[PDB]
Each structure stands twice: as C-alpha cells, then as structure tokens.
Design a protein around this nucleic acid. Structure first.
Lengths: 337, 109
RNA sequence: UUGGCGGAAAGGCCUUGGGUGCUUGCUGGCGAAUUGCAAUGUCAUUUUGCGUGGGGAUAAAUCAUUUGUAUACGACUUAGAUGUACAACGGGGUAUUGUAAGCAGUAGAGUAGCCUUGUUGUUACGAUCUGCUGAGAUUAAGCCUUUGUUGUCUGAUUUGU
RNA sequence: GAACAGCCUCUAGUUGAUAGAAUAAUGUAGAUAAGGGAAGUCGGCAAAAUAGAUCCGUAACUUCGGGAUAAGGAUUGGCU
RNA sequence: CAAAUGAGAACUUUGAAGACUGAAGUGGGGAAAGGUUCCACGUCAACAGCAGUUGGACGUGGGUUAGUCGAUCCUAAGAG
C-alpha cells in the first residue's frame, strides 16, 4: 500500500542509541484474509516434485473464476461447473482424490486466493497461488486443507510480531534503460563524441565476441526479487478502529494517512507493517514467506514496541496526523460556517 | 425519432492537456474535444463550431482554458450523408465561470 | 463378474464365478496337387472422411474499446453485456500557493481652496495599508463515490482431442 | 532603451519546411542541482561567475600619452 | 475551426481565430543574371523527395506604347 514512518525505542545493549527513540521507515502491506480454495499434492520423483492431483473446493469465488478467465464478461461462466457436479455427493470423486494425496504426495500445498474485492484496487481478479503446509504428516496437512476449504485464513494466524519474514515480489518496472543507470557504470567525459551514457570498451579483440559479463542497455526493473529478514513491526486488525494507536499515543486513528495512501487508497482490512522497504511498488501483490532458517542476530530477537506511527499526508508535506488535530491547529474556517 | 439529444457538458481540458508541448496544446484540445464528443455520443463525425475554436484559441496555443462548457448536440446527417447517419455538433456555451456545472440535458422547446 | 495390488514414468499381475471355442494327452476318417524346380511370395503400426451405431455438453481466445501496478513496438497488471459495474462532470478529503475580484475605511507620505470666522465639515487625486480573507486559484493528468447530475453496456476474426 | 543592437507592436507581407500517435534507451539543442570547489583533465576544454547607469575609490610600472572599466565598494522600483 | 470546389482536401479558395517577419523586414522597388518565369483560361501524365482540385508545371492565348526615364553623346583607367 505504501511507506510510512514509526518511532520506537531502540534496545540493543551496547549501542549509543540504546534505550533511545529511533525514527524508522516501514512498509504497509494490506492483507485481507485469503480464501483456501483447493489443495495439491506433490509426489517426489527422481526428477523432482511432481504434482499428482489437485482437489478444489465446491463453491469457488467469483474473483477466482475471474482469475481463471480473460474475457470474463463475455463468458458463459462455465468454470468448475462439472467439478461442482462431481461434487454435491459424499465422496464420489473427492474422497478418492484426497485419499490419493494422503497415500502419495510427500509435499502438499493449498491453493489460496486473495480478496481483491476487499483490497481498494480496481482489479476484481483475485490472485491465486500455492502455499506449502509445513507441519505434521501428509494426512494431517490434507486434513487441514480439507477442513479449511472455502475458509478465509487471516494473517494473524500465520505471521506474528517481532518476526523475520521474506518479501517476494516483482520490483517496479522502468522500461528500457541505458547502461549507466542499469548497471551504475562510470559516465564518460563531457567531450565524448557519440554519447557518454555508455560503456566505452565492451570487450577485447579476443575472444572475438561480446561477453555475457559486459554491461548493456535493456530492460530495468520488473524483476522477481526475494528479500529476506524483514521484521514485522505490527500485525494490525482491519475490524479495529485506532489501528495506528499505540500505548504511547492512544489516539483513535487508522493506519491510513490523511487523504489516503497515495495511488492506493485505504487499509480497511488487516495489515502488516514491516521494517524498511520491500521489492515492488504500491498496489502490487507481494508474497510474505516465513524465514528459511533460525535467525537470532540479536536483532531478529529484538522485541519491538511502537511508540508512534506517522499518519500524516504523504501527498505532500502534511503537518497534521488527524483531521481533528488539523482543525485544532487551524481553528474555524470559511468553508465550515 | 431518437438519437437527437442535446446535452451540456463540462470538459476538463486541464487533465486533458497536462504535460503537453506548448506548441501542440490548442490542436490537442481540439482533438480531445473531438474524442470527448465521441466518447459521450459514440459519433465519429464530430463537428466543432468556429466559436468553440475561438474559445479554445482565446489565449494562443498554450492558453487553452482549464474547463470548457460545451453543448454537444447529436444530429442526423443529410445532404449526401456520410457512413454514419448521426453526427455530433459541439458548441460553446457562455458562462461566467465553468466551475460548479453538471452535465444537463437540454430540449428543443 | 468378483478382490485388489501397482505413483518413479503407476497404464501391468493373478484371481471369484458363469458362457463359449481348440486341445498334439492317446488313438482314427476326409482334404491339400497346377504357385508347375525357387522368387518376402504379401498375415503386426502417433491420423482421418459424402459414411453406419453402444452414448454423451453446447466453450473460449483474439482484434476494436479501456487500463497503467506495464510499456520503443510487440508484450504485460487490469475493466467492459444492469452492477450498490464503468465513465464524464460536481462536493469532500488531501495537498500547493499565499490573503483573490469587488466593495468599504476619520488608514496613507503629500500636492491645490470654501466661508457658516477653524478640536470628523470637504473636493482632483495618491504606490501602498486595513477588513470581508489561511482568502482566492489549482488539485490526477500515475491519489475515491456516483448517497448529486448525466450517460455506456451484443461491434469483427479464429480455435479439432 | 545610449542605441537602424535585443525584446513587443501599427503599415505591408507570410503563415512556407511531409503528417498522425506515443514519450524507451542513446543522441542534438537548452537547463537545474545538496555538500565540496579543479580533487577532473595534456590543459579550467566546456560552463559558471562578472556585466547597464550614478557615486566613491583605484596600485606596480611607464615611452608621462597610459595602465584604468585597474583592483576594490555602495546605490538603482513605485508613489507624493 | 467551418464553408465552398472537387471523384478525392492536413496542404486549393473564402471567412474566423492564433501567430510570425517587426521598417539594415519574411514590406515596396531596382543593378548583374535569367528570359516570359508576368497575366487569363482548362485536368491528371510527368515535376513540386507527402498530397494536390494548387503551381514559377502542362496546353492555348494575351501582355512591355517615351522629344522629357535610360542607351545614344563625352571622356576615365585603358583599348586601338
């Protein structure tokens, strides 16, 4: 959704900012609860993990069938119609597929989809992905999936505060870029014929080819990136006014800034505030993944209590956090008689 | 005898011509008014009044007004009519200011 | 017809039973020529069709419009046949600037007189100042609703297991 | 305005130079830039700074004519 | 921007607007040179590096009036 600022007391026993307040950039990810619609089982083979079957839910959301379509509006909406016909019985072709996933498929992942209708984006096309279940036996995982069919999982169930996660996203695109900015090469001197935002020597005489390791112009951005070790600073609830309120501020205000998040809107759903930046731009789908190792660092184990969250306007230099505070500063106005 | 409607619109030439080169601003305003009429009445055949042209060019190439109050009347082609039976005629309507005005149907009466 | 078992690329293995045909296991009866003295002397397979029958449901993509989380062009996230959908305008929020036109003031450095015999009588003016007035103007063009108004919603091509 | 310089406008003339769409890189032309200030480079190349007018002030040297707009400072609108 | 003409108009014509040259002009004349390009009347073959209904193009025609303006006369450097 966007970036904002927090103030928190810093606690590392030995820094010169120990027990002193620090101002930190944070990224807000609006995370409405994702619906679990289906699961897939992967049998391990000497060629890797191979999916053996996918079992879907009985009723699928309109947004998920929109994901399955391209010209959704001029469609008969016939999607999983015969799958739901296969359904509506006890286990006519469903208990068998789940039993196959139990008997085989060492790795089982649930197919989940986002609530783009809850998110302020104009997409209406949900994002469907897989999420791997990482505990218990395969029978336990598939029982979990079948129990959670058509059910919405909230992010407070998976991600905790003071936790290190990884953000997987496609970074912001920047089109065709020159080598000077795409690779950070030294600019050529001002008196260079035929341009200077270039690499002067792109290779020796031999080998008589341009090598792959020489910097060239082309696409910048829109790359898949997986950045690790981002600390969750808050897991806030959408069904909760005073989201940005802490024990230090105690002001009834929502994480959404004054005038709304720029280019995005509001955070009327559950949200996560992570420390620092994450790959991708605003409005972009990001994937938040658990850490692949146990990180202590005496930084991952830091307990974070937020003292203040910035909710001033990001659409300029906003001097006020709340409309009540703005009115308190400026007094009565001509427009409000 | 339908498709002979006349409506008063307000077009935001500001958002239309944001970031345009100064020497192309009034020609682009003309083309944007044509596209506006096409989007609101579906008629490719958009004919602009010379007085509307004067309103657009009132302050030179780069001086196109921020908001223009237009009167778009969809009419029926005649006198060796073109491929489209319908055409739109875009007129200027004199107002003290073009702010605070909402699109309104006007009738021949 | 009855159990299954087999996921590494399972596409294979018996059986439970009913029906039918051969049996060289041991003995008989008829036939074979002439393809002429040999000539591979013709015997098994990723597809279909004016066609026949044991049965099944009537989908999408693409162009055009749109979008801007993309973009040299292609591509790429999106939307569009009645939805609390989309769009064009208007309030709000937000932000940028800095107090709008007009009107009024015994305000303003000063420049030229009246007579009804000089503590507000007044005129031809006068950059600026003050008040209405944190006013006015602009605000998505890459920040939202049509609780307000108004409109839009069946145009063209292709896809054989 | 010192000014047939640069800017704007009467008379007169022209509106001619293939166009449309979009706004990637690299270009050509024009700009801006924190803090530093030539560390860049053969070299301050290129650019920047200076600049009109009034007043004050103006050195070494000198062929006494200059140097000299030396250097170096201040002021500049509108109105009555 | 509209209208006209036209089979056909971004480019022709006529109105309307926006502009430009800005009087050492993109104005009004001339010298050398060109030679009919001047002017009127008709349309796509070529030409006007797009188009063209327009043209310095194509076809057919019309146009240059001197005692006073020049030449003519004189002499210059010079030629002979």
């Amino acid at each position: 959704a966007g970036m904002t600022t927090i103030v928190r007391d810093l606690d590392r026993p030995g820094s010169k900012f120990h027990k002193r307040e620090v101002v930190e950039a944070v990224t807000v990810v609006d995370t409405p609860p994702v619906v679990v619609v289906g699961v897939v089982g992967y049998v391990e083979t000497p060629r890797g993990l191979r999916s053996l079957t996918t079992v879907w839910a009985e009723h699928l959301s309109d947004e998920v069938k929109r994901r399955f379509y391209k010209n959704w509006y001029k469609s008969k909406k016939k999607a999983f119609t015969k799958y739901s016909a296969k359904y509506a019985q006890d286990g006519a072709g469903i208990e068998r597929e789940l039993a196959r996933i139990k008997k085989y498929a060492s790795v089982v992942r649930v197919l989940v989809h986002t609530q783009i209708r809850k998110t302020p984006l104009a997409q209406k096309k949900a994002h469907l992905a897989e999420i791997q279940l990482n505990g218990g036996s395969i029978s336990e995982k598939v029982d979990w999936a079948r129990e959670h069919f058509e059910k919405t999982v909230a992010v407070d169930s998976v991600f905790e505060q003071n936790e290190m996660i990884d953000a997987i996203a496609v970074t912001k695109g920047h089109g065709f870029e020159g080598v000077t900015h795409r690779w950070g090469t030294k600019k050529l001197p001002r008196k260079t014929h035929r341009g200077l935002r270039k690499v002067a020597c792109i290779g020796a005489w031999h080998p008589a080819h341009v090598m792959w390791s020489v910097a060239r112009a082309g696409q910048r951005g829109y790359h898949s990136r997986t950045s690790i070790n981002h600390k969750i600073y808050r897991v806030g609830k959408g069904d909760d006014e005073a989201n940005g309120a802490t024990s230090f501020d105690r002001t009834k205000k929502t994480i959404t800034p004054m005038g709304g998040f720029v280019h995005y809107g509001e955070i009327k759903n559950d949200f996560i505030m992570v420390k620092g930046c994450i790959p991708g731009n605003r409005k972009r789908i990001v994937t938040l993944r658990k850490s692949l190792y146990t990180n202590t660092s005496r930084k991952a184990l830091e307990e974070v209590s937020l003292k203040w969250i910035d909710t001033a306007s990001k659409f300029g230099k906003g001097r006020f956090q709340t409309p009540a505070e703005k009115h308190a500063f400026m007094g009565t106005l001509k427009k409000d008689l | 005898l339908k498709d002979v409607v006349t409506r008063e619109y307000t077009i935001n030439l500001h958002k239309r011509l944001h970031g345009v080169s100064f020497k192309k601003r009034a020609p682009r305003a003309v083309k944007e008014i044509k596209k506006f009429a096409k989007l609101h009445m579906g008629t490719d055949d958009v004919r602009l009044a010379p007085e509307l042209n004067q309103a657009i060019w009132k302050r030179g190439v780069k001086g196109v007004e921020y908001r223009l109050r237009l009167r778009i009347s969809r009419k029926r082609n005649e006198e060796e009519d073109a491929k489209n039976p319908l055409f739109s005629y875009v007129e200027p309507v004199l107002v003290a200011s073009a702010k605070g005005l909402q699109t309104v149907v006007v009738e021949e009466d």
